[PDB]
Amino acid sequence: AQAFVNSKIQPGKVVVFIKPTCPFCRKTQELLSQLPFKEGLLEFVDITATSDTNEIQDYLQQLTGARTVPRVFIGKECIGGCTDLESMHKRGELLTRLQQVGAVK
């Protein structure tokens, strides 16, 4: 669980931890898939594809303050879930943020 999520999160990368059958995971995927990411800099990680799904949620609770998916990380910074990603979008902050970390083409 620990080494698994810690290998995924990296400076300059966006990673969204998702589950199948998760309406908000899908909305998050819809928003970020449009953006001109460079290759390898956006990843959706299904936590059900590992045996220890609940232990991963436990570790995200410890790391971020919540265990709920979607869990969105921009670099090592967990910005939150769908709601928080959507606010940055509405405010126009998201593209600025992604350009600063060099995630965009």
Side-chain angles (χ1 to χ4, degrees):
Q2 300 192 144
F4 175 73
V5 340
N6 286 324
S7 64
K8 298 291 185 169
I9 49 186
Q10 273 167 335
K13 182 197 184 144
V14 178
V15 49
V16 184
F17 289 97
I18 64 177
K19 249 163 207 287
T21 316
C22 168
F24 281 10
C25 297
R26 291 295 304 141
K27 291 171 74 170
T28 299
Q29 295 191 275
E30 282 168 63
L31 189 274
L32 294 176
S33 297
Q34 315 298 349
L35 302 172
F37 284 93
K38 291 168 186 144
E39 182 170 301
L41 267 40
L42 172 66
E43 186 186 356
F44 302 104
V45 185
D46 183 356
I47 64 159
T48 285
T50 320
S51 32
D52 64 346
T53 308
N54 179 42
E55 270 65 51
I56 289 167
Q57 285 190 272
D58 290 358
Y59 187 46
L60 299 175
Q61 186 167 9
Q62 165 190 314
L63 216 61
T64 78
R67 70 154 57 212
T68 287
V69 295
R71 211 87 232 112
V72 188
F73 288 75
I74 302 189
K76 314 305 318 270
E77 180 181 61
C78 174
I79 58 97
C82 181
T83 316
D84 301 286
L85 226 213
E86 232 259 90
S87 303
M88 296 176 72
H89 170 67
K90 293 172 175 286
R91 290 189 275 114
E93 235 296 289
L94 182 61
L95 269 304
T96 311
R97 193 73 189 59
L98 260 17
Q99 242 294 143
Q100 288 166 205
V101 297
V104 161
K105 295 192 185 75

